[PDB]
Amino acid sequence: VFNATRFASVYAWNRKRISNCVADYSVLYNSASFSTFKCYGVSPTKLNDLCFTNVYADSFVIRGDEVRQIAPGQTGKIADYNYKLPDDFTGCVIAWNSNNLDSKVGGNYNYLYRLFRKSNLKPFERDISTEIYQAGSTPCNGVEGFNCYFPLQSYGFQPTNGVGYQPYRVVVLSFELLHAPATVCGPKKSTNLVKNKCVNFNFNGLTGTGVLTESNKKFLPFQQFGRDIADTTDAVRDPQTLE
Amino acid sequence: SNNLDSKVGGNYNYLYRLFRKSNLKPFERDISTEIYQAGSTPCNGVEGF
Amino acid sequence: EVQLQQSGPELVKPGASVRISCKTSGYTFTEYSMFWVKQSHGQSLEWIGGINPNDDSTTYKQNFKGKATLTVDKSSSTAFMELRSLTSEDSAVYYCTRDRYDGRVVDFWGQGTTLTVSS
Amino acid sequence: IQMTQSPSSLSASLGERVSLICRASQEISGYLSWLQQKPDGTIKRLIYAASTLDSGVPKRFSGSRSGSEYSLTISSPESEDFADYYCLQYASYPWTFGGGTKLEIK
Amino acid sequence: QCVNLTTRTQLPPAYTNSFTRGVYYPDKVFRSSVLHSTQDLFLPFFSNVTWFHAIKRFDNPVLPFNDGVYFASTEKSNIIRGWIFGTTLDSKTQSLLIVNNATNVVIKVCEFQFCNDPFLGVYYHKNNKSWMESEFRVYSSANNCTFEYVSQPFLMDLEGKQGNFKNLREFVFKNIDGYFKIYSKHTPINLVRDLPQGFSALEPLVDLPIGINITRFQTLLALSSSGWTAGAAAYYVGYLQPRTFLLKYNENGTITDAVDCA
Ligand SMILES: *[C@@H]1O[C@H](CO)[C@@H](O[C@@H]2O[C@H](CO)[C@@H](O)[C@H](O)[C@H]2NC(C)=O)[C@H](O)[C@H]1NC(C)=O
Ligand SMILES: *[C@@H]1O[C@H](CO)[C@@H](O[C@@H]2O[C@H](CO)[C@@H](O)[C@H](O)[C@H]2NC(C)=O)[C@H](O)[C@H]1NC(C)=O
Ligand SMILES: *[C@@H]1O[C@H](CO)[C@@H](O[C@@H]2O[C@H](CO)[C@@H](O)[C@H](O)[C@H]2NC(C)=O)[C@H](O)[C@H]1NC(C)=O
Ligand SMILES: *[C@@H]1O[C@H](CO)[C@@H](O[C@@H]2O[C@H](CO)[C@@H](O)[C@H](O)[C@H]2NC(C)=O)[C@H](O)[C@H]1NC(C)=O
Ligand SMILES: *[C@@H]1O[C@H](CO)[C@@H](O[C@@H]2O[C@H](CO)[C@@H](O)[C@H](O)[C@H]2NC(C)=O)[C@H](O)[C@H]1NC(C)=O
Ligand SMILES: *[C@@H]1O[C@H](CO)[C@@H](O)[C@H](O)[C@H]1NC(C)=O
Ligand SMILES: *[C@@H]1O[C@H](CO)[C@@H](O)[C@H](O)[C@H]1NC(C)=O
Ligand SMILES: *[C@@H]1O[C@H](CO)[C@@H](O)[C@H](O)[C@H]1NC(C)=O
């Protein structure tokens, strides 16, 4: 998503449904490459602590003035006719200047945005339709004409453009929780295993205290911990170096 | 207090603390204006990335 | 108030041009198209053409395209019609109008403008 | 490409029914508007989109599509409504109008 | 593809006694030389377990999934190759498809428009003097999909061997708080036409956080378009119920015997 060769243009924004994986947002937030990292659901630091049902990654190119509009509750041709976030957007907007990557020397014209629409689009809609626009009362029975403008016009991206008319890539991480089990979790920190010493142990959620020792027990390929007559834990299997 | 504490152009005289290094203690008061470092880099001076 | 402050009654000797304004108000000027009409003292009204004040694009009746020229100025928020080489064909009550797709089509009209070309 | 208004002038008492017609030689797909002109220069829209009206204007106007014909019909005359009437055909460029019809006292 | 194969001898729905089978490890906890007592969705001891077989006969009706469902096959040549689970089965909701085929296991969840009679087909002997998969007729099209796993590729046998049953395959399927849990076992057998009397403990093999509701399920079998030979296999279905069980864990941590406390 972040290192793709060619992004979608804003009218036709790509979505990737990130799920069944561990999401190391520390790689993202520590990156010197980003201009903007606006998180609306939670504070950016805590993203490695959370877990979600899915993380939709919406990707598109817009102008460096328009990146601001991607924030929730914004008014403007990108926020209204191309890509709209809901008032309770529980996610992050991430953006970077890609002028040296998306500005052909004589100008690039591959990226289109909708300048015109009969109504603002609803949150997370996408409108691929090229249907000629009804800008004038006269019905647009033609393929082109006065007041029959093509809704999709194209950006002006040139290397010598100002910050504002240089292309910004954007990705919006829409994180969601549903009634389904959360599968997009963060990377769980794992500090060194120490032995013959009284220590606080957290083995896959199992908070406890005790002296850890190398066991002579032999569990089954499926077992991960053990208990005693009292239904109290007395043995656990190391999740990284299986012992 | 809308008719005593609100201005048509915005009353900006009132501040809240959006950032801090740690969870503040009961009845403790925080006067600091030191720049909060969200990124992993140290961040000396009046502003930074 | 969708008013139309146009130019008052006007005369010039033939073989000469003219200047005709239509100021518009009560709406954001680039949200609507502008068109024009020529109604003679005796003969019917006809459509001269229009300008979209947003996109600076134009369209005309083929008959008038060769003698009309429509323009706007955004800072003045005003429409402006020029007549080039006026003769015994070029005299009427001229009228400005406003248009859109969402129901506001040719509803309100400028008080017109006397463009007599007689001596 | 213009449609034709049946009569050039029409005369009435107050109260009498008044029908005004703008026939079509080609299909305008129902894109048409009715306009009111006073002999002293006052222009204002009556009807659009065939049947849509009732906007800052006397409630009596009606203009439902009559097949091959486009229409205006009124539930009374009035002092100001003794005036000129025009149909606008905008379905296509170039725009055109009917020749107009004048409504008068007897 | 979506084809109907109506050439089958109609037989009554046979029933069979589950002999103290379908017990699984209820948790991932080591216990040793101890008699743990547990309440869970177990298959009761001596429970009527519906019996279906493929002969002349090719018995594949859609069944209810209830809360959990013990499934087993006694067979050879590898006839039973998959399960369909869902609540609509016609793409109006997501549903789950598990298919073990000539090349890999696929586990995936989609809005699938399933066929009324789903199966997979094999060319038998044919030209290469060997047996090859030729047909995959489960759904017409899948649209929205949430999860997809595929095994690394393998080449197990589709060979039409003869004789009695030699594999006794076993499964438990449960669906708790969005987690679809599979438990399973294999054992060698030498068994003619029944579910064998004995005791087995099913180890968990996978868990899937799919979140979907399930209420119905079915089995997918290896079969010009009608008139065909069905390979000899038998399979069995029982519905799990909330039951207290007492479980003998031996010194090696394996459930060695069990007692159905009702
Ligand atoms: C996680 O990865 C580490 C490697 O980073 C694995 O440790 C390796 O194990 C192999 C096989 O025993 C050894 O040959 C390597 O020398 C080990 N590398 C290191 C750096 O320790 C570890 O086994 C993996 N754990 C799991 C659960 O897969
Ligand atoms: C396979 O059998 C099913 C069940 O009979 C068929 O489903 C029927 O399809 C027809 C249209 O062809 C519908 O009018 C019926 O209402 C359906 N019946 C049921 C019970 O669903 C299905 O079409 C058959 N498939 C093929 C390809 O023959
Ligand atoms: C068994 O089913 C799997 C899953 O549909 C098939 O795997 C596909 O293999 C083709 C090439 O043969 C690849 O292009 C696809 O990407 C694979 N799909 C997936 C999702 O794994 C496999 O081919 C099937 N085997 C047979 C013999 O039909
Ligand atoms: C499953 O797929 C269907 C079909 O693509 C989706 O239905 C679309 O829903 C969007 C959003 O409401 C509509 O704009 C489209 O018009 C629908 N398409 C059709 C053909 O009906 C449906 O939303 C998908 N469901 C999920 C949970 O993703
Ligand atoms: C626990 O597991 C061990 C390991 O397999 C079993 O020990 C085996 O016992 C059999 C039967 O006497 C011998 O043939 C094997 O050689 C033994 N294997 C090894 C390497 O020890 C033991 O029997 C099991 N105990 C129980 C009761 O489950
Ligand atoms: C199986 O079901 C039949 C009725 O269909 C019943 O008579 C019989 O006792 C049942 N046997 C078992 C194993 O419970
Ligand atoms: C024989 O095998 C080839 C490819 O291996 C296949 O195309 C052909 O269909 C097979 N023969 C028959 C009768 O199907
Ligand atoms: C699952 O089913 C229950 C009850 O039928 C319902 O409340 C819930 O919304 C369903 N969930 C999904 C994802 O369909």
Q: What is the CA angle A219-A221-A224, rounded to 5?
A: 60
C-alpha span between A69 and A76 (Å, rounded): 7
Sheet strands side by side (includes C68-73): C4-6, C16-24, C78-86, C68-73
C-alpha span between B37 and B34 (Å, rounded): 9
Q: Which residue, by CA, sits nearest to atom 8 of ligand 2?
A: E116
How far, in Å, are A28, A39, B38 from residue A23 at the CA level?
A: 10, 16, 19
| Chain C partners within 8 Å of D32 (Cβ) | none
Which region, left, alpha or beta, applies to residue B38 given φ > 0 means left and ψ of -120 to 50 means alpha? alpha
Q: Which atom of ligand 1 is nearest to the CA of A239?
A: 27
C-beta atoms of A226 and E252 within 8 A: no
A135's tokens: 């800008």
Q: Searching chain C, which residue's CA lies closest to the CA of residue D84?
A: C44
Handedness of CA E80, E86, E91, E94 (dihedral sign): negative
Buried b (16+ CB within 10 A) or exposed e, D58-75: eeebebeeeeeebbbebe
Ligand 8 center to E213 CA (angstroms) = 6
Ligand 1 center to A243 CA (angstroms) = 13
| Helix, coil or strand: residue A48 | helix
| Chain C partners within 8 Å of D33 (Cβ) | 105-106
Helix (H) or strand (E) holding E248: strand E241-249
User: C106: closest CA among D31, D41, D80?
Assistant: D31
Ligand 7 center to E127 CA (angstroms) = 6
A140's tokens: 């647009």
Assign 3-class secondary structure to A191-232. CCCCCCCEEEEEECCEEEEEECCCCCCCCCCCCCEEECCCCC
C-beta atoms of A135 and C58 within 8 A: no
Beta strands in A7-69 (DSSP E): 14-18, 36-39, 51-52, 54-63
Question: How is chain E split into domains, by residue range?
Answer: 15-262
C70: Cβ–Cβ under 8 A, 6 or more apart, which residues?
C34, C36, C48, C49, C50, C51, C58, C60, C79, C80, C81, C82
Q: Which residue, by CA, sits nearest to atom 11 of ligand 6?
A: E48
Q: Which atom of ligand 8 is nearest to the CA of E212?
A: 13
E91: Cβ–Cβ under 8 A, 6 or more apart, which residues?
E111, E112, E113, E114, E141, E142, E143
C-alpha span between A184 and A24 (Å, rounded): 10
Query: Running DSSP on this structure, what letter comes out for residue A15?
Result: E
Number of H helices, E strands in chain C: 1, 11
Is E44:E242 a contact under the CB 8 Å cutoff? no
Q: Tokens 């378009």 identify what position?
A: E225
Q: What is the number of alpha carbons within 13 Å of residue C93 lying toward its C-beta?
A: 19
Who among A118, A136, A145 is closest to C33 (CB)?
A136
Is E110:E117 a contact under the CB 8 Å cutoff? no
Burial class (CB in 10 A: 0-12, 13-18, 19+), E122: buried
Instruction: Say what the alpha-carbon torsion angle E85, E91, E92, E93 is, to the nearest 10 degrees.
Output: 40
C-alpha span between E84 and E220 (Å, rounded): 7
C102's tokens: 């969402």
Whether chains C and D touch (3+ CB pairs under 8 A) is answered by: yes
Q: Which residue, by CA, sits nearest to atom 5 of ligand 1?
A: A240
| Helix, coil or strand: residue A58 | strand
Residue type, C32: Y
SS percent in chain B: helix, strand, coil, step 5 = 10, 0, 90
Q: Tokens 């439902």 identify what position?
A: D64
Is E69:E217 a contact under the CB 8 Å cutoff? yes
Ligand 6 pocket mutation, candidates E47, E48, E194, E236, criterion most atoms within 8 A of CB? E48
State the CATH class of domain E15-262. Answer: mainly beta
Distance (Å) from the C-alpha of residue D80 to the closest C-alpha of chain A?
28
The reported resolution of this PDB entry, expressed in Å, is 2.8
